Design a protein around this nucleic acid. Sequence first.
RNA 1: CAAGCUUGAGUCUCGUAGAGGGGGGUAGAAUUCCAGGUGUAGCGGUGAAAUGCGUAGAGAUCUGGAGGAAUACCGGUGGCGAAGGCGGCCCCCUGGACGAAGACUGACGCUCAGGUGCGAAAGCGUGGGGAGCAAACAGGAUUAGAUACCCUGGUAGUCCACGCCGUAAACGAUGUCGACUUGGAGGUUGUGCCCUUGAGGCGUGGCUUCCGGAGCUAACGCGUUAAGUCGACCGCCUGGGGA
Lengths: 271, 104, 88, 66, 129, 70
Amino acid sequence: AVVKCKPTSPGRRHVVKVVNPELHKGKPFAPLLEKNSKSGGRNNNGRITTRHIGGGHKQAYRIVDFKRNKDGIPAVVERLEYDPNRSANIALVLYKDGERRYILAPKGLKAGDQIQSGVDAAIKPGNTLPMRNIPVGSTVHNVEMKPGKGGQLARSAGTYVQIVARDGAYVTLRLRSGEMRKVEADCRATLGEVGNAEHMLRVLGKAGAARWRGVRPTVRGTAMNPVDHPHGGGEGRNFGKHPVTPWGVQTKGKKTRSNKRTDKFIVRRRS
Amino acid sequence: MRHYEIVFMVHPDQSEQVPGMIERYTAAITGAEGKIHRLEDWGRRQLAYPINKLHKAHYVLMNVEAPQEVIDELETTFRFNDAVIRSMVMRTKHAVTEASPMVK
Amino acid sequence: SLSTEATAKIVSEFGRDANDTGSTEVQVALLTAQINHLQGHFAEHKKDHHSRRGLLRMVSQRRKLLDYLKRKDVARYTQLIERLGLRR
Amino acid sequence: FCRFTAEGVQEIDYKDIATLKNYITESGKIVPSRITGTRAKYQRQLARAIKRARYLSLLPYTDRHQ
Amino acid sequence: SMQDPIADMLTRIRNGQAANKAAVTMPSSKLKVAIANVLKEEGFIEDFKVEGDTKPELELTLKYFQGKAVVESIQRVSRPGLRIYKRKDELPKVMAGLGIAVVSTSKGVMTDRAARQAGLGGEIICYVA
Amino acid sequence: PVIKVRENEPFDVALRRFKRSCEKAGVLAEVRRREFYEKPTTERKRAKASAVKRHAKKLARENARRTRLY
RNA sequence: CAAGCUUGAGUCUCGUAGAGGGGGGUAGAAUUCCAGGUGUAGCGGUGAAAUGCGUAGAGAUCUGGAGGAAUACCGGUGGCGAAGGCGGCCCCCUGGACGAAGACUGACGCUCAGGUGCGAAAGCGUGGGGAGCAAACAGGAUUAGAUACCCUGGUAGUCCACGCCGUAAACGAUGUCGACUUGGAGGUUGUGCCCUUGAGGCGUGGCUUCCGGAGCUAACGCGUUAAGUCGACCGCCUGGGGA
Ligand SMILES: [Mg+2]
Ligand SMILES: [Mg+2]
Ligand SMILES: [Mg+2]
Ligand SMILES: [Mg+2]
Ligand SMILES: [Mg+2]
Ligand SMILES: [Mg+2]
Ligand SMILES: [Mg+2]
Ligand SMILES: [Mg+2]
Ligand SMILES: [Mg+2]
Ligand SMILES: [Mg+2]
Ligand SMILES: [Mg+2]
Ligand SMILES: [Mg+2]
Ligand SMILES: [Mg+2]
Ligand SMILES: [Mg+2]
Ligand SMILES: [Mg+2]
Ligand SMILES: [Mg+2]
Ligand SMILES: [Mg+2]
Ligand SMILES: [Mg+2]
Ligand SMILES: [Mg+2]
Ligand SMILES: [Mg+2]
Ligand SMILES: [Mg+2]
Ligand SMILES: [Mg+2]
């Protein structure tokens, strides 16, 4: 549920919290945790390869099961948990055989709910089955692109995909971007939309919240000197040039997809 | 326990698969202590208009007294089952055991 | 609406002499039960205004009945409100 | 005059296709109660039945559609 | 809701007189009955008759002279919304003594003249002309 | 309005039949009605007028037109 | 104040008709767009034109797909709802009304300043959605001018979710409840009897349309659903502007 903060201080004035009382008030399941050290947007060459990253709160990596492989054996959801790594929420599930795994939490999923992966798996939210077994028209999330690879599409907070068509060995997917994409019919996908839908409604409220999320301040190109950015320089506020990246590439409109390998899967580009 | 009236059309290619389906449906109804008052396989029948590109369909009628949960389950089964094209579960006041005009 | 069997049961519970059905107390109980039933409905269906109107009317009627009981015989009223667990 | 009153039917059946066919025109449209002489109570029932039939492909929505 | 029975009765009477009805019937009351009796005494109605045990019905036989109604005008004075009480000297005269004013007095319901004779006032029920 | 020309049938007669069928359908009229969006108010108003019109005409016929005109 | 009574008011039994409300599904027709086929020079539009779309192949025509919105016919001075309003079909949850007999409760009622809720359309906020329609805007006409009417386009908006807004010729321009008073022609929804000897006959209730009598009204008209005859309670008006 969305909660607007009382303006007791400036910088608290605009803050909107997403408060979910269904989340686990306690420690994550340690066997599925692992160390996740920060980059600061720097590669193996130690150069900043992506600006505006650094700082933020220390985050343990939750080992989310995107692959979803436990076929036939039904799980029960123990608890929904906060995951710092993703916009979505995750759920600690417990298989009848004894294994515990984290999965992406779907929309209507709660504690005590039963889920199943497999071919025989019944069509209900949270359940995972090959897309040739899933009826056409359904909302689906955590979609595999290559059979067995692991969910790759519609992972984020409230996202989902529609199975618009099934034609032979390919199912056509209406991606969240609006892109129509052919994917193999034998690819695994988890029924329903991913859970934390109201995530977008939250507002950070102050610069500090951005920092906490590991985001360093973005400097306007036009603020810089000509040496620093193609937008740089000018007495007062000048900007006679067409908008470009820091590396002089048109930023308003200039299409940059070059991947000729995957072009055959793309039925229609997003609009 | 509410009196319903279920009528479902099956794909003409799946016509030999129909009796088993019927049996299964009956079984489920029986499970929740539900009565089955009249059951009429109308057979293969020519449609007034083509539905999803076909011109013939296999018609089945089934009047049943049951709870609503099982009816809901049946509806769900129908929706997910590709062999059954159309399905019309309809609430009825009485048992209506008497034969239909088209069978008559 | 309230099922026949339930109504009968209510009558049996609150009826001073057999299945009298008309008693003020009985009526109040019937209304109360209906209100309770409808609460669940209204939790689900927030925008069902026409139905809500009916509920409100029922509530009003119940209140009126309670008031009538109060002026008539206080002890009985008290007993009823112990039974049903209403604040006033 | 009304045919349903003389017969005294409890409810008009959507499965009774032939009877329904008498109350729809060449283009598949429902014939008005003024033309048929049907009572208003039964007329609505008949209409409902026709609609049901249309849904269940027993009667057509229109003469054209193929 | 019905708030004035006497007024209703009077209205009924008026309507009967208008519509040339021989008899007018209504649910009976004691005060009503008294009023009817008074009217009979004064000669504005032919007869009054109470009939029934559980819920009795007063039946008034209306009076007509030369094809036209005897009761020309009939108006309530005291009413539930506005009660009217007069003293013996304050007692009104309907049609300059020709018409009557039905008054509920300490010593029963009577005409205004009778009340005056007695030497007592009370609630003026209605004027009859 | 599907019309099928039968054996040993003239063209003109067939045309006439087709026309009749069209009339029965009320297809042209329907098209005319749907040519522009009529406001619901306007639709109601027209209906009311029609209702008035019919009744008034009937009244004129039955009651007013049973007397010596000449 | 005390005891009662059953006619007001309410409860119960069985049915009845209904676009009453909320939620979830689905169907068919059509518009639009997308892909492809056939095919060739116009299409579109109007009072007449032009802008516009078209030999980069339109319009037309067939196939397949996508999506949104609205539900032809039935459909009715028909129905339901307090009003606003509500219209494909199906299911789930649900409010009201009426009749039929009885049985019960026993005045528990009416009205209502403040207060609370509901409240068309447009609008506003966040998030969706977006076919058609279309404020704004653009171009073409028309014209003395045309910030219009007409045409080609077309964005908010219209649709959904949750909030806000609280107004309309929100009208029957007629506050709510009760009683009484000549009639006729209907419609609709029950129900009792009668040989249903037939679609009928004789009744008796509920809701409703038109005509009209007495009466009322300035007149127009209203006229058992009153604007008649009365009672109860509330809201409101005090010359026209300014306002
Ligand atoms: Mg950045
Ligand atoms: Mg920034
Ligand atoms: Mg900046
Ligand atoms: Mg500088
Ligand atoms: Mg430098
Ligand atoms: Mg440079
Ligand atoms: Mg400068
Ligand atoms: Mg410059
Ligand atoms: Mg109901
Ligand atoms: Mg007020
Ligand atoms: Mg709006
Ligand atoms: Mg908006
Ligand atoms: Mg946004
Ligand atoms: Mg928006
Ligand atoms: Mg658009
Ligand atoms: Mg325009
Ligand atoms: Mg347009
Ligand atoms: Mg106003
Ligand atoms: Mg209106
Ligand atoms: Mg007004
Ligand atoms: Mg009131
Ligand atoms: Mg009149």
